[PDB]
DNA sequence: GCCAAGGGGAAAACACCCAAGACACCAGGCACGAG
DNA sequence: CTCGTGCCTGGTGTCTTGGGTGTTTTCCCCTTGGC
């Protein structure tokens, strides 16, 4: 089927050699500034630092979802429930 | 608009779909923000920690780079 | 330099895979263009009529007595609806509930109606869904016997409540039979190989269970099929032909030795119909609650069983003129994945990819694999997923979620050796859409290169030689002439070896 | 409305807390309050709990700091078919607002509730429901002490039997 | 201490063989290993039980250990 | 074959210690496998630190480094 | 004969599997928002 | 400027608990026996 929706989205899988940030950059940048502000004022954020955080977090959250999926799968569940995130975090030991 | 919602449910839904996660409880989206905030908070703290030795009042990707290292999240694509 | 071990496995495989891609598209076009002449499947339904006319309806004592009543012969409940003996076929009742509310007993009858007929895709089951519906009926009667009664007011409710569940479950069960019963070819027989040394195995637990709970039994090979006979006398028969695959799982590293049967057609265990069946037995202590003789007995018992089974197989293979070669899953060719819900070790066999240890059983007949797609494959991931495309696109793809990325190259190689065409994609787009899309317009699909659409445009396919690419934003890193000059301060100080 | 008014054009006509998320029994129920019992109206089953049977009422802040568990100790336990519950557990979010109307006269509302409440109110379901039921059953709202974990939650992550739940140090 | 010191030492010298002969170990090292060995298995079982809990079971299974190590990132 | 020498009760006692209530016999096969993989890496590292120190018998100093290097660090010692 | 100890039988408390259903998630669609 | 984010709806599907197994353990019945 040559029609739209088919061609682009189909090929976008192959056009997507790109590494588009999944969280909206400005919505996120504002949160960075916000949490940054939550820590300390006068903090200039270089867009590079904003990108560094954004990209790390997206992959990182995807990473968290890898474990969360496992744990859902572990419990014979498809839908993840926060208990899975928690399980994952506890097991990773990546807790504050 | 409040940036905590800036990490909109679809922004989350995209990441979870990419982490292979299929159905998502509403409840998850909320914890994700907490986790993300916890995650970021540790990172930003460290970025500031680095920034203070540099006598800077500007946050650089170097501080983040030097920070992600320390958390086992070493990042390539920054610096000189 | 030139420290690379050997040509990458992919480069070797690429020619064959690239070859397979060409072969696939040609192959796909004929099969599919030829298949495009076939057609869809039809269905029918009937109305739940309690009684043909007001005279055929009962006149039972409860009806006279202002009591809720059940006519089992007509699968109908008769209730005094504001003094009116009104029937309701049990097929309309969803379920019931009862409550004691101080001095009274309340019987609540819930019926199927829009919004209440939850879960079924049959939203608006009703021949006229826009009609108004009796959602539910609630009757009350005091818990206390009133003067002159033959039964407590609440006793009628308590008996109607109880009997409704009885007639309802009986109806639901007879209904469920027809759902599981239809779609089964009458098997001709089995023909027991009377007065012959019919190979046999006796420590066998069938899977799934025939009755509510598991039983042991023994499996015998006969003239044209197997028979599993339970220790409680139940007979289970398997024509040899109806076995799509016979796969044998030795108890190596598994707490059970298993013979897995993947069937060309599902068969009824009375309770349910199954396309997959197993015979197995426990290798040891599975339920320890918190030594050589025990450990050695494990080694012996395994070998003993392992041999007995291996012998049974050989005896059957010989008996079967080998028409039932027992594929043994090539364990080192297995990998961790989840075809259904739980993580298990998927293993390839001579003609299938399976995991028979766990239940439900997972079996992929590689003959039916049209193509494979490794979704979510990306460097940052630690796991990935695999999708199976079938040769009959009217049937859904199968996912094999969260397979670890460490198995990436080994799996491709296995697939390569199976002559299986695979493709990778960081994205995970909708296959149901992709299937209908290609089902509706395979001609145009193939014309757009068909399945080449999955190609990540690695090598110079002339059709789209330039893919969708553009320069990023750089001058392909070229260090400027002035940047090199600081090198002279590499001061020659002969610092001690 | 058209059908309802038509019925009412011939008809002869306490309150319902609608859409209550119960963890025990599991489901969503509408509490049709009554003079001596609450008729926990459900999607298939329903139950009436005479206020006399409630041993205690507890308000337990969820560790998520976003939900609250409201607990009603039942004696006798409701007989859920064969299964029986010594408790009624409700889960409500801290931001799950609602409005409640009592089909009672304001004199009666004042009479029974000492002016602590009004015939019509709106607000957070947890605070509101805790107050409304505190009256019908008279039991005081039980709350955790100064126990707030290292994680700040007023309960502890644990497991009991074949499951996980929260242990609250009341 | 929960494993027999001999089989444990035998295994240590045995696997050492696969890397290099001549290797033997002073008591302090083999003890230190067991001391480390027990801590690792302890942690792993605790974690595995968390999975057991999470899976609503009490009988742990290899997959529980697999998942725990899998999530833990013990593998390559 | 000394991994087979790591007795089931030894493992069983650690599992009881780890609060596990019940175990399936495969845990032993699995536990032995886990023990090897941990040991393989710790010893290879222990071997390498000893190899660097120019010695053929491993000392606690060397194993501390092998575990510490892996974050599997031991406690109670100093020098 | 009065008074007491022991083996055994039927059962209870537990960790686990199988079935049903309801809510809560994504999918579908029209609209507002701010990148 | 208009794609992205969102309020609303229906459905499912998929997570929860009910029904159930049989294993590890106790309290009880049955009967013989000793002072």
DSSP string computed for chain F: -GGGGS-HHHHHHHHHHTT--EE-THHHHHHHHHHHHHHHHHHHHHHHHHHHTT-SEE-HHHHHHHHHHTT----S---
CB C344 within 8 A of CB C351: no
- When computed from its CA atoms, the radius of gyration of chain F, rounded to whole angstroms, is 15
Q: Which of residues 1-60 of B touch A (CB under 8 A)?
A: 3-4, 6-8, 11-12, 14-16, 18-25, 27-28, 31-32, 35-45, 47-48, 57-60
SS3 of B75, please?
coil
Tokens of F21: 């209530």
Domain coverage including residue F71: 1-79
The rounded Cα C253 to chain-centroid distance in angstroms is 25
Other CB atoms within 10 A of residue C159 CB? 17
Tokens of D89: 């557990």
The owner of tokens 């493709």 is C423
C167 φ/ψ angles, rounded to the nearest 5 degrees: -65, -35
CB D118 within 8 A of CB D42: no
CA B66/CA C3 separation, integer angstroms: 32
CA C161/CA C138 separation, integer angstroms: 11
- Would strands A44-45 and B58-59 be described as parallel, antiparallel, or unpaired? parallel
CA E35/CA F60 separation, integer angstroms: 11
Buried b (16+ CB within 10 A) or exposed e, C84-113: ebbbbbbbbbbbbbbbebeebbbbbbbbbb
CA D138/CA B20 separation, integer angstroms: 50
Give the CA dihedral B7, B12, B15, B17, nearest 10 degrees.
Answer: -160
B68 φ/ψ angles, rounded to the nearest 5 degrees: -55, -35
Which residues make Cβ contacts (< 8 Å) with residue D126, sequence separation at least 6? D59, D68, D70, D92, D93, D94, D96
Picking from F7, F21, F25, the nearest residue to C285 by CB comes out as F25
Q: Which residues of C touch B17 (CB under 8 A)?
A: 428
C67-75 long-range contacts, CB within 8 A, separation 24+: C67/C151, C67/C156, C67/C160, C68/C107, C68/C139, C68/C156, C68/C157, C68/C160, C69/C160, C70/C160, C70/C163, C70/C164, C70/C167, C72/C163, C72/C167, C74/C50, C75/C50, C75/C167, C75/C171
> According to the 3-state scheme, what is the secondary structure of chain D?
CHHHHHHHCCCCCCEEEEEEEEEECEEEEEEEECCCEEEEECCCCEEEEEHHHEEEEEEEECCCCCEEEEEEEEEEEEEECCEEEEEEEEEEECCCEEEEECCCCHHHHHHHHCCCCCCEEEEEHHHHHHHHHHHHHCCCEECCCCCCCCCCCCCEEEEECCEEEEECCC
CA C228/CA C215 separation, integer angstroms: 11
CA end-to-end span of chain F = 36
Name the minimum distance, in Å, from the CA of D76 to any CA of chain A: 32
CA F12/CA F25 separation, integer angstroms: 10
C203 φ/ψ angles, rounded to the nearest 5 degrees: -80, 85
Picking from A1, A7, A74, the nearest residue to C440 by CB comes out as A1
CA C152/CA C139 separation, integer angstroms: 14
- Ramachandran assignment for F52, one of left (phi > 0), alpha (psi -120 to 50 degrees), beta (any other): alpha
Q: Do chains F and A touch (3 or more CB pairs under 8 A)?
A: no
Kindly state the helix (H) or strand (E) to which residue C204 belongs, with its residue range: strand C200-207
CA F9/CA C374 separation, integer angstroms: 43
Tokens of B17: 């779909």
**C-alpha dist (Å) from residue C301 to C296, E62, F44:** 8, 21, 36
- The residue ranges of DSSP E strands in C290-343, in sequence order, are 335-337
Which residues make Cβ contacts (< 8 Å) with residue D22, sequence separation at least 6? D28, D29, D40, D88, D89, D90, D91
CB D162 within 8 A of CB E58: yes
The owner of tokens 């495989």 is C13
CA A43/CA A56 separation, integer angstroms: 20
Length B66 CA → H22 C1' (Å)? 59
**C-alpha dist (Å) from residue D34 to C142, D90, F40:** 18, 19, 71
The rounded Cα C4 to chain-centroid distance in angstroms is 44
The owner of tokens 């039916």 is C368
Which residues make Cβ contacts (< 8 Å) with residue D125, sequence separation at least 6? D17, D20, D92, D96, D97, D98
Length E73 CA → G35 C1' (Å)? 39
Residues of chain C immediately before an interruption (C to N > 2.5 Å):
290
Other CB atoms within 10 A of residue C339 CB? 23
C400 φ/ψ angles, rounded to the nearest 5 degrees: -140, 80
How many Cα atoms sit within 13 Å of C191 on the Cβ side?
4
CA end-to-end span of chain B = 36
The owner of tokens 């140090």 is D169
The residues with which D157 forms a beta bridge, in sequence order, are: D166
CB C70 within 8 A of CB C77: yes
Picking from A38, A53, A78, the nearest residue to B43 by CB comes out as A53
Give me the CATH number covering residue B77: 1.10.20.10
Length in residues, chain E: 76
CA C20/CA C423 separation, integer angstroms: 11
Q: Which nucleotides of H are covered by protein (CB under 7 A)?
A: 4-6, 10-24
Resolution in angstroms comes to: 6.4
CA D63/CA D66 separation, integer angstroms: 8
CA A87/CA C22 separation, integer angstroms: 46
Name the minimum distance, in Å, from the CA of D85 to any CA of chain B: 26
How would you class E37 by CB atoms within 10 Å of its CB: exposed for 0-12, middle for 13-18, buried for 19 or more? buried
- The residue ranges of DSSP E strands in C8-147, in sequence order, are 69-71, 76-81, 84-89, 93-101, 104-111, 136-142
Residues near chain G strand, CB within 7 A: A 24-27, 30, 79; B 1, 9, 13, 16, 23-27; C 95, 118-119, 271, 359; D 21, 27-28, 43-44, 161-162; E 52, 57-60; F 21-22
Which residues make Cβ contacts (< 8 Å) with residue B73, sequence separation at least 6? A56, A60
CB F28 within 8 A of CB F36: no
Other CB atoms within 10 A of residue B76 CB? 7
Name the minimum distance, in Å, from the CA of A74 to any CA of chain E: 6
CA A65/CA A79 separation, integer angstroms: 11
Other CB atoms within 10 A of residue C245 CB? 21
C313 φ/ψ angles, rounded to the nearest 5 degrees: -60, -55
Give the CA dihedral F23, F29, F35, F41, nearest 10 degrees.
Answer: -140
Kindly list the strands in the beta sheet with C69-71, ordered across the sheet, starting from the edge strand earlier in the chain.
Answer: C69-71, C76-81, C84-89
Tokens of C188: 């001709």
Buried b (16+ CB within 10 A) or exposed e, C6-39: eeeeeeebbeebeebbeebeeebbeebeeeeeee
From the list F67, F5, F68, the residue with the least C-alpha distance to E13 is: F5
Tokens of A68: 């969360």
CB C264 within 8 A of CB C243: yes
D135-142 long-range contacts, CB within 8 A, separation 24+: D136/D33, D136/D38, D136/D51, D137/D51, D137/D54, D137/D57, D137/D72, D138/D51, D139/D54, D139/D55, D139/D56, D139/D57, D140/D57, D141/D57, D141/D58, D141/D59, D142/D56, D142/D57, D142/D58, D142/D59, D142/D71, D142/D170
The owner of tokens 């507890």 is D58
CA C403/CA C406 separation, integer angstroms: 9
CA B47/CA B69 separation, integer angstroms: 11
The owner of tokens 């396919």 is C461
Taking an 8 Å cut-off on Cβ atoms, the answer to whether E44 and F18 are in contact is yes
Q: What does DSSP assign to residue C256?
A: E
User: How open is the CA angle E31-E33-E36, to the nearest 5 degrees?
Assistant: 110
The rounded Cα C67 to chain-centroid distance in angstroms is 47
Tokens of C148: 């002159």
CB A71 within 8 A of CB A87: yes
Q: How many domains does chain F have?
A: 1
From the list D23, D135, D138, D122, the residue with the least C-alpha distance to D70 is: D23
The owner of tokens 């019908």 is D136
**C-alpha dist (Å) from residue A9 to A2, A24, C262, C269, C434:** 12, 20, 37, 45, 10
Buried b (16+ CB within 10 A) or exposed e, F27-48: bbebbbebbeebbebbbebbbe
Q: Which residues of E touch D162 (CB under 8 A)?
A: 56-58
């Amino acid at each position: 089927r040559y029609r739209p929706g088919t061609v682009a989205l189909r090929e976008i899988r192959r056009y997507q050699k790109s590494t588009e940030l999944l969280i909206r950059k400005l919505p996120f940048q504002r949160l960075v500034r916000e949490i940054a502000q939550d820590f300390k004022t006068d903090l200039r954020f270089q867009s590079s630092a904003v990108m560094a955080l954004q990209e790390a977090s997206e992959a990182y959250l995807v990473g968290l979802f890898e474990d969360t999926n496992l744990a859902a799968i572990h419990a014979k569940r498809v839908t993840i429930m926060p208990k899975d995130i928690q399980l994952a975090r506890r097991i990773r030991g990546e807790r504050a | 608009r409040d940036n905590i919602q800036g990490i909109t449910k679809p922004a989350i839904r995209r990441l979870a779909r990419r982490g292979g996660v299929k159905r998502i409880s509403g409840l998850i989206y909320e914890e994700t923000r907490g986790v993300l905030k916890v995650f970021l908070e540790n990172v930003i703290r460290d970025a500031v920690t680095y920034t203070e030795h540099a006598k800077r009042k500007t946050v650089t990707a170097m501080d983040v780079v030097y920070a992600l290292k320390r958390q086992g999240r070493t990042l390539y694509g920054f610096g000189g | 330099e030139r420290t690379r071990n050997e040509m990458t496995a992919e480069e070797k495989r690429r020619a064959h895979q690239k070859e397979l891609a060409a072969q696939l598209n040609e192959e796909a076009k004929r099969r599919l263009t030829e298949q495009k002449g076939e057609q869809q499947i039809q269905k029918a339904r009937k109305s739940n009529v309690s009684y043909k006319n007001p005279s055929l309806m009962p006149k039972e004592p409860h009806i006279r007595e202002m009591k809720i009543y059940i006519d089992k012969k007509y699968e109908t409940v008769i209730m005094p609806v504001f003094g009116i003996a009104t029937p309701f076929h049990i097929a309309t009742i969803k379920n019931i509930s009862m409550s004691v509310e101080g001095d009274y007993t309340y019987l609540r009858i819930n019926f199927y109606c829009p919004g209440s007929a939850l879960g079924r895709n049959e939203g608006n089951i009703f021949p006229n869904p826009e009609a108004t519906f009796v959602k539910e009926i609630t009757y009350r009667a005091s818990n206390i016997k009133a003067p002159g009664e033959q039964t407590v007011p609440a006793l009628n409710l308590q008996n109607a409540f109880r009997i409704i569940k009885e007639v309802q479950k009986r109806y639901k069960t007879r209904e469920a039979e027809e759902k599981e019963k239809e779609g089964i070819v009458k098997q001709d027989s089995l023909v027991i190989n009377l007065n012959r040394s019919n190979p046999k195995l006796k420590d066998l637990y069938i899977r799934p269970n025939i009755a509510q709970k598991r039983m042991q039994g023994s499996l015998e090979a006969h003239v044209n099929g197997f028979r599993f006979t339970s220790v409680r006398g139940d007979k289970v028969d398997i024509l040899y032909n109806n076995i799509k695959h016979a796969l044998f799982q030795p108890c190596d590293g598994e707490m059970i030795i298993v013979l897995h049967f993947h069937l060309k057609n599902a068969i009824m265990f009375g309770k349910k119909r199954h396309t997959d069946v197993q015979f197995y037995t426990e290798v040891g202590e599975i339920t320890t609650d918190l030594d050589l003789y025990a450990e050695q007995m494990e080694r012996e018992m395994r070998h003993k069983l392992k041999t007995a089974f291996k012998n049974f197989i050989e005896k059957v293979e010989a008996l079967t003129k080998e028409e039932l070669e027992f594929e043994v899953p090539f364990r080192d060719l297995g990998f961790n994945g989840a075809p259904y819900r739980s993580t298990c070790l998927l293993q390839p066999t001579s003609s299938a990819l399976v995991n028979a240890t766990e239940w439900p059983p997972f079996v992929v007949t590689l003959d039916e694999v049209e193509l494979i797609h490794f979704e979510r494959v990306q460097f940052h991931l630690k796991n990935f997923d695999m999708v199976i495309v079938y040769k009959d696109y009217s049937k859904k793809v199968t996912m094999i979620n969260a397979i670890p990325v460490a198995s990436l190259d080994p799996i491709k190689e296995w697939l390569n050796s199976c002559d299986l065409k695979y493709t990778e994609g960081v994205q995970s787009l909708n296959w149901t859409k992709i299937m209908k899309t290609i089902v509706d317009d395979p001609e145009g699909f193939f014309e757009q290169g068909g399945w080449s659409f999955l190609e990540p445009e690695g090598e110079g396919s002339d059709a789209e030689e330039g893919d969708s690419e553009s320069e990023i934003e750089d001058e392909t890193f070229n260090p400027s002439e002035d940047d090199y000059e600081e090198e002279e301060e590499d001061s020659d100080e002969d610092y001690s070896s | 409305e058209a059908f309802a008014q038509n019925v009412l054009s011939k008809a002869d006509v306490i309150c319902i807390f609608r859409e209550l998320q119960c963890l025990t029994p599991r489901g969503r129920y509408d509490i049709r309050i009554y003079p001596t019992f609450l008729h926990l109206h459900g999607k298939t089953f329903d139950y009436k709990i005479p206020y006399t049977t409630v041993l205690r009422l507890f308000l337990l802040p969820h560790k998520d700091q976003r939900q609250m568990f409201f607990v009603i100790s039942l004696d006798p336990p409701i007989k859920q078919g064969q299964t029986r519950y010594h408790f009624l557990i409700l889960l409500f979010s801290k931001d799950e607002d609602i409005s409640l109307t009592l089909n009672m006269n304001e004199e009666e509302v004042e009479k029974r509730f000492e002016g602590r409440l009004t015939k019509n109110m709106s607000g957070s379901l947890y605070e509101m429901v805790s107050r409304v039921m505190k009256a019908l059953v008279n039991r005081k709202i039980t709350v955790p002490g100064n126990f707030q974990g290292h994680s700040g939650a007023q309960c502890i992550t644990c497991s009991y039997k074949a499951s996980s739940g929260l242990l609250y140090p009341l």
